[PDB]
Structures are given as structure tokens and as C-alpha cells.
Design a protein around this nucleic acid. Structure first.
Ligand SMILES: Nc1nc2c(ncn2[C@@H]2O[C@@H]3COP(=O)(O)O[C@H]4[C@@H](O)[C@H](n5cnc6c(=O)[nH]c(N)nc65)O[C@@H]4COP(=O)(O)O[C@H]3[C@H]2O)c(=O)[nH]1
Ligand SMILES: [Mg+2]
Ligand SMILES: [Mg+2]
Length: 90
RNA sequence: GGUCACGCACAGAGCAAACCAUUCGAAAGAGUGGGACGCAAAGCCUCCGGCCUAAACCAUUGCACUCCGGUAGGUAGCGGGGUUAUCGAUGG
């Protein structure tokens, strides 16, 4: 089940697209060298964000730590992505 | 000469993009002053599509890498259409 990418949801939708990005960068670069962190507030993909890592070990490292984490007045919910990013799917 | 189309001109006259100053706005943006990229309606109207915005209100717990909720504002200089209008090539 493990993956390069981790899926977080139940985040605060009020937070700006670009603010939410830089928010997660400093808090998750604590585990690896993040490739890219795709987020949008579009109806389907709002309140949620994907974290693409260079190492899977670093993604696993980040996962088994911060589940249920209060972050911008909201519990954070980590779980691996099922299908990788187009940057990794090759 | 009207009416409706057309724009290769004359001739007069009209707005005014970027930028900057300043105010209103969360923002997109708009207003005025300066400025002139262009414009045959770059006069005006959000009715049809698109794009830009997302502060609040309701909507949503959602696995993306075409994008994509409502609502609301914006854009007429994004097209579409409605309406008003100037010149008049021995002009069609
Ligand atoms: N009086 C009058 N003359 C017309 C008309 N249509 C064409 N012309 C003449 O033919 C030229 C070509 O017009 P254009 O290709 O649309 O190209 C034009 C046009 O796109 C624009 N322009 C100039 N004046 C105006 C205006 O008052 N309103 C608008 N919307 N555009 C203008 O600048 C360009 C060159 O300027 P011009 O010296 O006017 O150059 C014009 C003008 O001399 C019209 O409806 N009325
Ligand atoms: Mg002229
Ligand atoms: Mg208007």
C-alpha cells in the first residue's frame, strides 16, 4: 500500500491556495525533500492536498507520525495515494 | 435624400490600452487626473457562451496531475446578440 505521495484531507478550505502550499512545505520538509505539493480549492479537490516526495521512505516516515494533527483549527488526515503523480508514473 | 449593408478613402471630429498618481474594493476590478497601445461604434446593455475573482452566505469530506459547485461581483478593449450613431471613394 505505500506510495511516494500522501493524501491529506479535512483541512480548512478558508486557507488560500498559495498560502496552504507554503504552509505544508516547511512542516513536511521535516521528513524529506518535497518534489511538488499540488493543491487547489476546486469543488472536488478542496480541503485536501497531495505531497509528492523524492523518497518513498521519507513519505512513509511522514505518514506514521502526524495522523489527527491539529493544523489551522482542523485535524489532519494522512494516507498514501493509490496512483502516483504523472511526474513519477513513468 | 432616407432605409439597410459595405469600409480601398477624403474631411472633420471621439474615445483611450500599458504605465503612473489618487480614491472605492478582500480581490478581480472600477472611478478620476495624467498618458496613447490601439479602436468604424474601443457608444451604451450581462440576455447566450467564455475567461478573471473568491470576503461573506449556503454547498461539499472530496484521489487529483484537461479543467470544472452555488451565489456574487467583474470583463462591452473575449466573442455572440439587442440598441443608438458619424463620414460617404462619379462610393454597393
Ligand atoms: N467617418 C468614418 N470613416 C470611416 C468609417 N469606416 C471607415 N472609415 C474610413 O476608412 C478608414 C478605415 O477604417 P478602419 O479599417 O475600421 O480603421 C480605422 C478605425 O478602426 C479606427 N478609428 C478611427 N476613428 C474611429 C472612430 O471614430 N471610432 C472607432 N470605433 N474607430 C475609429 O482607426 C482606423 C484609422 O482611422 P481613420 O482616419 O478613421 O481611417 C478610416 C476612415 O478614414 C466610418 O464608420 N466613419
Ligand atoms: Mg482622422
Ligand atoms: Mg457594466
Amino acid at each position: 500500500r505505500p506510495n511516494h505521495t500522501i493524501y491529506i484531507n479535512n483541512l480548512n478550505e478558508k486557507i488560500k491556495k498559495d498560502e496552504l502550499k507554503k504552509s505544508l512545505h516547511a512542516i513536511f520538509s521535516r521528513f524529506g525533500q518535497i518534489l511538488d505539493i499540488l493543491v487547489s480549492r476546486s469543488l472536488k479537490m478542496r480541503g485536501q492536498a497531495f505531497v509528492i516526495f523524492k523518497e518513498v521512505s521519507s513519505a512513509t516516515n511522514a505518514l506514521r507520525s502526524m495522523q489527527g494533527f491539529p493544523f489551522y483549527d482542523k485535524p489532519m488526515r494522512i494516507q498514501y495515494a493509490k496512483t502516483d503523480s504523472d511526474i513519477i508514473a513513468k
